[PDB]
Design a binder for these strands. Structure first.
Ligand code: MG
Ligand code: MG
Ligand code: MG
Ligand code: MG
Ligand code: MG
Ligand code: MG
Ligand code: MG
Ligand code: MG
Ligand code: MG
Ligand code: MG
Ligand code: MG
Ligand code: MG
Ligand code: MG
Ligand code: MG
Ligand code: MG
Ligand code: MG
Ligand code: MG
Ligand code: MG
Ligand code: MG
Ligand code: MG
Ligand code: MG
Ligand code: MG
Ligand code: MG
Ligand code: MG
Ligand code: MG
Ligand code: MG
Ligand code: MG
Lengths: 180, 126, 103, 125, 51, 134, 148, 51, 51
RNA sequence: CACGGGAGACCGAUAGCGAACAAGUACUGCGAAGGAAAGAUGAAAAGAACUUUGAAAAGAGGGCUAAAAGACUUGAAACCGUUGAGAAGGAAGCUGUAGAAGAGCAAUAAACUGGACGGCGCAUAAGGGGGAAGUACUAAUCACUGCAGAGUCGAUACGUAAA
RNA sequence: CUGACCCGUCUUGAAACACGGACCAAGGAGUCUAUCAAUUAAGCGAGUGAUAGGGUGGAAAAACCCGUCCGCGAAACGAAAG
RNA sequence: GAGUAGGAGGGCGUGAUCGUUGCCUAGAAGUAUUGGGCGUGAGCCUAUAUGGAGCAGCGAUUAGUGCAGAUCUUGGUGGUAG
């Protein structure tokens, strides 16, 4: 008998989600990056693996405007890789020359990036280009969603700015003085 | 099958068969014609009658040939002369037969028959 | 009544058992409509399927920008066409007597 | 006759695990079930009671699924399965299904002797 | 993704390629995702039922 | 491919038979009866089928890649060789087609066992024709 | 469906995970049916997750007609995104005449400025404009036109 | 006596698939139909078939 | 397949250059990996130099 | 709802309408009203001839039949009788460990692999030439990518008052 | 030889002088419809998706194409004028 | 390496549907077993006997899917007891 927490069987939450997707291709891409991860001591690949094993919802959108906004002098020559789907921002007027690598390009994002003199890359290609991730730029998109506003603090606790779940927005809906 | 109004249900058909009124039954129980007769009337099958000559094609009694004594439609039986079995007390009893296991060697001929045959041949060859 | 989820909105409060509607006829119904239409053509053969419909603007501020098929022609219009309502009707034209031209 | 190497096969417990109080009733069969009772002796590990089914009891991975004749058990459904035993001949023994008819049995026995395969259900006269 | 030319065979003859050689359509290119076949097949089967 | 096909057919293959959670395959070209990338002949490149004929002749079937050609050599599944030397011939053929150590061992197994098999079969066919006659 | 559901894994556990003490019972346990006692024993619920549920707000509309209140909004940033690329480029190079964008045909009525505009000149035909919409439109080298 | 949940007519059996996924499905299906390993893997007998 | 069949296949579906006609804007799936051989990719120069 | 049609990821004789059947029947209630149970011998009655003992039911012989399957398909459990092997001084059963007796067409066992040689029957070996098919390379050709003339189809908030 | 109270249940407390259970077979209890949410796999993405309905189609209620509107997102804050 | 209430992960067994691989008058299902074995366990395979027409595996789809109890339903039976 020993007094160890969780009996030394403590589960490790520090790990990479085992993905259940069914596109045979994700599983394969993943075989690839498992290789690159154990046999390459490059953080970049390990990173790619963690983020490609993401919850369907945990993959977040990259927009052309997002890329454009994050660009340094060196960011421009560098391969841009998002772990996610890349999409067009209709409100981006001129589109730079880009070599981008994502999982998925909205056909609009593709058309505009290509017709601007750009190149679209897939991770099997990226592997071949720079396994160490040399001169590569890994884009982590910003995280927004509606769910987030119902979370946080509860709706009507002191200083709660969180949103209530309501079936309609009207003067009559949870917009009237509560029972105070 | 081509037609929505054709019942494919086991139930409905079995029903039709066993619920068959006499006249339709006679049709349902019918025999196959001899090579000769087939050729003569240009007709494959014929509904059996009580005066016909037949050959038992299949059964312990296969191979025997004779006249049809009784068409007992209710019992679903055809009786053929000398197709009986004898009982230990010395009492004879007929042995029933399913038409579709018979073959028609010689028909009972008469006007109505000939007309039927004629219609069949008619749609057939034409 | 337990968690943070949105206040339910009762549905089955009355006896709905008597009040349910089922959509299986839909399958056959579509079909029926088809044949109806077709049998119309055949019986109407030399003539067109749908009778003549004028056009107007829609009735709402938001709909004004769009175009809509009217039920009938304005007597004013038949006049400028030179047709009597009766005749236009013998022709396959659709007439509507309560509609008026303000433009 | 093609045995392979054994670790000596060691069986942790022989006696079947009998469902509690199933000797008392006809309505109760002996197929094991785990007592949820609140008072339940067994569920509580009372000194003297059955030790209920446990994992410490699972036989070692090496001997697990080993026949007393030395082979792993392979079930013959159709003829085809036989042939598979060819590349596997030394590891497994054949077992011909009960649903397979006498003629097809002799057939598969012949085929077995040919493919050099061992048969547990083989007909001995 | 290969798009080799495919021979259009002749019926009258056991094995004869007609003079016609046709480059392969992209449909045959399409990724083989089983997920999508699965879901779709499932639901579409379900669509035949009578209540 | 062998990768994509693995993932595709690993579970649903029509050559599949299970025993106590051990998956075996009916594949004629299987180098091991068991269902594994390697066991599965219709998937990867190395697979062999062997049939007896004309007293020594082994029909060797060399799993061959999917082919669009001018002439059709054999079944799309594979290539078909009649070998009269059989055992020795096929042993060579194997040595050529299976470079790695294991695959060699396995194929060869398929051979030894195959052959002795075909020998017994011969004996039996003999006794059978002499049974039909006498 | 069915074989995924809890029941299957609950068979033989006697309480169906409803508890031995508190088992699964009728409305009394729900705390009364529906929105029952929201104001009383359910106070905490209502207050906490649907605050402002009970009460009244300002002005009754006896018959509210939405159709005439209908006013889709557009922002400056999406303007050039409405008309094709052909247009804005061809009049970037050509200063002879300037582009007219009808927000109307796109199904929008008021134009609000949101982002900023290319320095290339435009005319925009809309039902309404925001002080800033007009600001940025004019400053760009562009013009605002009132439609109905 | 009556059932646990007497079963109704209005149980919703039929499901509706997004067009794009119906299509993607048919596609990937066709894609599949083109490779020997797969159709052989389905149990079809293609041995004497050519191309 | 027929000729008419096989040929219409493309018009109906389309290809990574063009949309489909019959599907009126259907674009076939965009592959996740150009090359489905992880063999090629794990086993090439770039890979192993670094490995 | 009535008479018709067809159908089903329904049910399958304690299910399915209450009723697969002389079922809204038998039966009960002054009455309004209540309301069940109950389907499968066999391919064919060939439904058990005849002898014998019985007052009779029936038994023993004998026979039909693929089989008695004989008021009838299969024929589980509870319960009961017979036959076998055991056991018991105010109950029984049971975990762990050994032993005894009883019942047995036996599931385990010194076999298996190879070298050399012998006796038998069958095939034709390695090595060498050879080199169809295969893979790899590689010019000339050619799918695909790229560029792209002429015809036909389409699109187009480029353009015109429309063209 | 050593160990061995009757199970199920409610209870702080059950072998209880707590309740149900003489025995056996078959039957026998978290479903179905709707609603919102969180998570997981899918598709597409500033868009997305139809429904109704049209049009074709297998023997067949499938399927396959069309579907000017509509939903929901894309703008919010106000009782409201705005 | 304990565990009631409770939760999670894997697995056993049962209908029916779309597939795939097969078995059966040379005897399927069902049934009995002091025959031989396999799983820690749901359960399994075989043998013999009976039986006399249908069955089974594998991948999915779906569920009126697993009973010792509810003074539970219907039916059949005990001890009391000649
Ligand atoms: Mg310990
Ligand atoms: Mg408001
Ligand atoms: Mg006929
Ligand atoms: Mg009607
Ligand atoms: Mg055991
Ligand atoms: Mg669950
Ligand atoms: Mg529990
Ligand atoms: Mg007697
Ligand atoms: Mg018998
Ligand atoms: Mg007894
Ligand atoms: Mg004694
Ligand atoms: Mg005793
Ligand atoms: Mg004694
Ligand atoms: Mg003691
Ligand atoms: Mg007891
Ligand atoms: Mg007491
Ligand atoms: Mg009480
Ligand atoms: Mg529809
Ligand atoms: Mg909105
Ligand atoms: Mg059922
Ligand atoms: Mg027999
Ligand atoms: Mg099984
Ligand atoms: Mg027998
Ligand atoms: Mg299953
Ligand atoms: Mg039961
Ligand atoms: Mg019971
Ligand atoms: Mg009594």
């Amino acid at each position: 008998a020993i007094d160890l927490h969780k009996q030394g069987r403590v589960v490790k939450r520090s790990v990479v989600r085992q993905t259940k997707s069914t596109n045979v291709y994700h599983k394969l891409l993943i075989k690839l990056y498992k290789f690159l991860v154990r046999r390459t001591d490059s953080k970049f690949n390990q990173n790619i693996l963690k983020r490609l094993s993401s919850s369907r919802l945990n993959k977040f959108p990259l927009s052309l405007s997002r890329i454009v906004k994050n660009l340094n002098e060196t960011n421009k020559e560098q391969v841009i890789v998002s772990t996610s789907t890349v999409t067009n921002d209709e409100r981006l007027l001129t589109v730079p020359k880009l070599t981008v690598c994502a999982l998925k390009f909205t056909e609009t994002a593709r058309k505009r990036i290509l017709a601007a003199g750009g190149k679209c890359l897939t991770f099997d290609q990226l592997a071949l280009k720079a396994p160490t991730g040399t001169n590569c730029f890994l884009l982590r998109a910003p995280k927004s969603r509606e769910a987030y506003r119902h979370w946080g603090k509860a709706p009507g606790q002191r200083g709660s700015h969180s949103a209530p779940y309501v079936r309609s927005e009207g003067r009559k809906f949870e917009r009237a003085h509560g029972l105070k | 099958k081509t037609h929505v109004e054709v019942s494919s249900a086991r139930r409905k058909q079995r029903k039709a068969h066993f619920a068959s009124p006499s006249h339709l039954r006679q049709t349902l129980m019918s025999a196959h014609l001899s090579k000769d007769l087939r050729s003569k009337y240009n007709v494959r099958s014929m509904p059996v009658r009580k005066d016909d000559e037949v050959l038992i094609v299949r059964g312990k009694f296969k191979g025997n040939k004779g006249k049809v004594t009784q068409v007992y439609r209710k019992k679903w039986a055809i009786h053929v002369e000398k197709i009986s079995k004898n009982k230990l007390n010395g009492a004879p009893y007929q042995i029933p037969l399913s038409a579709s296991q018979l073959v028609l060697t010689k028909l009972k001929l008469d006007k109505s028959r000939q007309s039927l045959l004629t219609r069949k041949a008619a749609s057939l060859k034409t | 009544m337990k968690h943070n989820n949105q206040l339910p909105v009762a549905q089955l409060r009355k006896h709905q058992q008597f009040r349910i509607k089922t959509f299986f006829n839909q399958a056959a119904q579509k079909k029926a409509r088809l044949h109806a239409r077709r049998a119309q053509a055949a019986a109407v053969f030399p003539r067109p399927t749908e009778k003549l419909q004028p056009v107007v603007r829609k009735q709402t501020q938001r709909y004004n920008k769009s175009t809509k098929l009217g039920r009938g022609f304005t007597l004013q219009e038949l006049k400028a066409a030179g047709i009597s309502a009766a005749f236009a009707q013998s022709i396959g034209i659709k007439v509507d007597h309560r509609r008026k031209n303000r433009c | 006759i093609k045995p392979v190497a054994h670790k000596k096969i060691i069986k942790k417990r022989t006696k079947k695990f009998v469902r509690f109080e199933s000797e008392d009733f006809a309505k109760l069969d002996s197929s094991w079930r785990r007592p949820r009772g609140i008072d339940n002796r067994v569920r509580r590990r009372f000194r003297g009671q059955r030790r209920m089914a446990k994992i410490g009891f699972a036989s070692d991975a090496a001997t697990k699924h080993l026949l007393p004749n030395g082979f792993k058990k392979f079930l013959i459904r159709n003829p085809a399965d036989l042939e598979i035993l060819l590349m596997n001949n030394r590891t497994y023994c054949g077992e011909i299904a009960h649903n397979i008819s006498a003629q097809v049995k002799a057939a598969l026995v012949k085929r077995a002797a040919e493919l050099g395969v061992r048969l547990t259900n083989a007909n001995a006269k | 993704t290969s798009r080799p030319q495919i021979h259009v065979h002749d019926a009258k003859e056991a094995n004869k390629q007609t003079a016609t050689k046709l480059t392969l359509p992209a449909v045959f290119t399409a990724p083989i995702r089983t997920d999508i076949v699965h879901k779709v097949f499932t639901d579409l089967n379900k669509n035949r039922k009578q209540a | 491919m062998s990768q994509l096909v693995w993932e595709i057919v690993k579970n649903n293959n029509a050559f599949l038979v299970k025993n106590n959670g051990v998956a075996f395959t009916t594949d004629p070209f299987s180098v091991t009866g068991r269902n594994t990338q390697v066991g599965l002949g219709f998937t990867h490149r190395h697979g062999v089928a062997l049939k007896g004929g004309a007293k020594q002749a082994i029909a060797t079937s060399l799993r061959k890649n999917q082919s669009h050609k001018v002439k059709k050599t054999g079944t799309i599944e594979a290539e078909t060789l009649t070998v009269k030397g059989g055992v020795q011939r096929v042993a060579k053929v194997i040595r050529g087609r299976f470079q790695s150590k294991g695959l060699k061992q396995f194929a060869l197994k398929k051979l030894v066992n195959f052959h002795r098999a075909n020998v017994r079969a011969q004996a039996n066919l003999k006794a059978e024709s002499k049974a039909k006659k006498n | 469906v069915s074989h995924l559901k809890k029941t299957r894994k609950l068979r033989g556990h006697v309480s169906h995970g409803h508890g031995r003490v508190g088992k699964h019972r009728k409305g009394g346990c729900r705390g009364g049916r529906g929105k029952a006692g929201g104001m009383h024993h359910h106070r905490i619920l209502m207050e906490k997750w649907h605050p402002g549920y009970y009460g009244k707000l300002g002005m009754r509309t006896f018959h509210l007609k939405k159709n005439p209140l209908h006013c889709p909004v557009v922002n400056i940033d999406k303007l050039w995104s409405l008309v094709s690329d052909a247009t804005r480029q061809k009049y970037a190079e050509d200063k002879k005449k300037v582009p007219v964008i009808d927000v109307t045909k796109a199904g929008f009525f008021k134009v609000l400025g949101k982002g900023r505009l290319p320095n290339q000149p435009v005319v925009v035909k809309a039902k309404y404009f925001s002080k800033t919409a007009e600001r940025r439109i004019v400053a760009v080298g562009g013009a605002c036109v009132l439609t109905a | 006596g009556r059932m646990f949940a007497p079963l109704k007519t209005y149980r919703r059996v039929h499901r509706r698939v997004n067009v794009n996924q119906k299509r993607h499905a048919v596609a990937a299906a066709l894609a599949a139909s083109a490779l020997v390993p797969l159709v052989f893997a389905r149990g079809h007998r293609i041995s004497n078939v050519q191309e | 397949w027929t000729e008419s069949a096989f040929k219409k296949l493309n018009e109906i579906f389309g290809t990574y250059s063009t949309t489909g006609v019959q599907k009126s804007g259907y674009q076939l799936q965009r592959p996740l990996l150009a090359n489905a051989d992880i063999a090629r990719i794990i086993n090439s120069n770039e890979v192993q130099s670094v490995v």
